[PDB]
Amino acid sequence: ALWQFNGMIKCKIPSSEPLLDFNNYGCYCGLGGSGTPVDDLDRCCQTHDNCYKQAMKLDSCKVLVDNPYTNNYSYSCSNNEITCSSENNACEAFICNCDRNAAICFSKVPYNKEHKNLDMMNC
């Protein structure tokens, strides 16, 4: 679920405010997205967007009770490291990994403030 994804980002980037810093950035970070990514962070979000699209088409996930935004899974944060629990079912496990990869990607790229709130004519 989104609140668990927020927890993962914090696990990796303690000094961030997830829902604020990674929203309305580039052509892909935030609800929706399309066009040419403007930088590396924008590319992480393009990848995460595609992962969620795949999860919504997974057979093990029930239509739209098991969606990525509200499906809770089991995970743990150990020394700024993220672990998806083996007690999770198939659908829960795929979503946990989408979030895990994004949290890591975010922690490995630069944040360019000049790319906040760009108009669509630039994508």
Ligand SMILES: [Ca+2]
């Ligand atoms: Ca997006």
Ligand SMILES: [Ca+2]
């Ligand atoms: Ca669940």
